[PDB]
């Protein structure tokens, strides 16, 4: 059983599947870094509580887009909203504000997730993010813009393990193929997610599998606490 | 063609019989108990600082299919407001809809506020006033106070020329921790047809939706298309 609520892991558990409208295709850093991929690092500060620090490698392995993550959580309160499992099983819509990080040839992002708490309060999770390409080839450095998200969380009635079924749609806003990497996302792409986590000493792992359809911005994934 | 109002404002109008009621709450599922005859769903939707929808719907089985047939009348909308000006974001937030019994007319009632995100970063409130009455004289379940918790995502079909909305939602009942033949009609996946006849500020339109619902898991999948 996960020592943290599933919704707190959603943002850590592949922005290359975002729908970039045609007029914005030149601003899609994430696909342009493929197939070699990018490193995505975040600090997630849960206000009045602890923080996650994450580092992920997102790249193709053959036909599969893989997101392999190491997560480290510290300074959490034993019966705060996170370790005390006080968060509703849902995930609100957010805007992910992206800016170029020119001299590191990557991007940064900032956004604040709002997790609904059982008692009607809200638990904020302030995200700071930086992505750096792994490969040597040129990438697309964007003008400032944002990604707007929508997500539904559910359970598989046949799954006895602790798990999360996720469906999300993400579209870019706020501004032929623009990169060769973009062409690797033309159809439905299988996804593998592997997370190794330690939060206040509670060790855990998550494996997710599913597929993404970047033309529509859609992700469908099932995650299992292994 | 293009609807005169934003799709998100029609989501609540466009089948609560597909809510997942947990086993211990099965004696609180009015919506399924009214089946298969059905129920009349009537709403006032008051958009803050703007117009209002009045809606009248018939929700019943047409043989195998669960059908939601609605008449909507929208009045007093500002031509440059958030609704007629199409200034609402294409999403739909999670809500808790509080259900109470309306014993005197053998149905339920609900008052809830939808918060529609506006393009300028603000919110457009839509206060909903709902009343549901069973269509027949048979027995129905009048529930204790509880709520429905919803999650919805809206999307588009990239090759659909017509104004349309792809919708997926999960809804589960909650708020009771204590523990009908219509219930049997939802044992598996049920096909759904939605037909809406609309008039907002004199702009007439129609919507047709098709999909299915699985009340055992609370899941609804529908594609809606403008048909006039």
User: How is A102-159 classified by DSSP, letter by letter?
Assistant: TTTTEEEEEEEEEEEBTTS-EEEEEEEEEEEESSSS--PPPPSEEEEEEEEEE--TT-
Q: Tell me if A167 and B156 make a contact (CB, 8 A cut-off).
A: no
Total domains in the fold of chain B: 1
Q: Is B91 domain-assigned?
A: yes
Detail the DSSP E strand segments found in B76-202: 96-102, 107-117, 123-134, 146-155, 164-174, 189-200
Find the CATH number of the domain harbouring B184.
Answer: 2.40.155.10
Q: Is B2 domain-assigned?
A: no
Cβ pair B64, B36 in contact under 8 A? no
Q: Is B130 domain-assigned?
A: yes
Resolution in A: 1.5
Cβ pair A123, A87 in contact under 8 A? yes
Residue A138 CB contacts under 8 Å (≥ 6 apart), including other chains: A32
Q: What is the DSSP letter of A70?
A: E
The pair of structure tokens assigned to B29 is: 């599922």
Full domain range(s) for residue B100: 7-226
Residue B17: other Cβ atoms inside 10 A: 27
Q: Is B62 domain-assigned?
A: yes
Q: Is B23 domain-assigned?
A: yes
Chain A: give the shortest CA distance to residue B156, in Å.
7
Q: Tell me if B91 and A148 make a contact (CB, 8 A cut-off).
A: yes
Q: Is A1 domain-assigned?
A: no
Size of interface A-B (CB pairs under 8 A): 45
Q: Is A214 domain-assigned?
A: yes
Mutate to test the interface with B, among A92, A154, A185, A214 (most CBs of B within 10 A): A154
Question: Cα–Cα distance between A68 and A208 in angstroms, integer?
Answer: 10
Q: Is A93 domain-assigned?
A: yes
The gap between the terminal CA atoms of chain A, to the nearest Å, is 9
């Amino acid at each position: 059983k996960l020592p943290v609520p599933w919704p707190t892991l959603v943002t850590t558990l592949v922005q290359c599947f975002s729908r970039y409208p045609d007029h914005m295709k030149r601003h899609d850093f994430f696909k342009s870094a493929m197939p070699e991929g990018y490193v995505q690092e975040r600090t997630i500060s849960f206000k009045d509580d602890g923080k996650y620090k994450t580092r992920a490698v997102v790249k193709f392995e053959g036909d599969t887009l893989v997101n392999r993550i190491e997560l480290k959580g510290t300074d959490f309160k034993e019966d705060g909203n996170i370790l005390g499992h006080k968060l509703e099983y849902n995930f609100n819509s957010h805007n992910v504000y992206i800016t170029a990080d020119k001299q590191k040839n990557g991007i940064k992002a900032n956004f604040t997730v709002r997790h609904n708490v059982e008692d009607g309060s809200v638990q904020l999770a302030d995200h700071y993010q930086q992505n750096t390409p792994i490969g040597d080839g040129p990438v697309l450095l964007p003008d400032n813009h944002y990604l707007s998200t929508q997500t539904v969380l559910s359970k598989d009635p046949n799954e006895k393990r602790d798990h999360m079924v996720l469906l999300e749609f993400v579209t870019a806003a706020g501004i032929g193929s623009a990169s060769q990497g973009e062409e690797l996302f033309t159809g439905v792409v299988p996804i593998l997610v592997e997370l190794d986590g330690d939060v206040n000493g509670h060790k855990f792992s998550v494996r997710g599998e599913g597929e993404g359809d970047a033309t529509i911005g859609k992700l469908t994934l099932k995650f299992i606490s292994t």
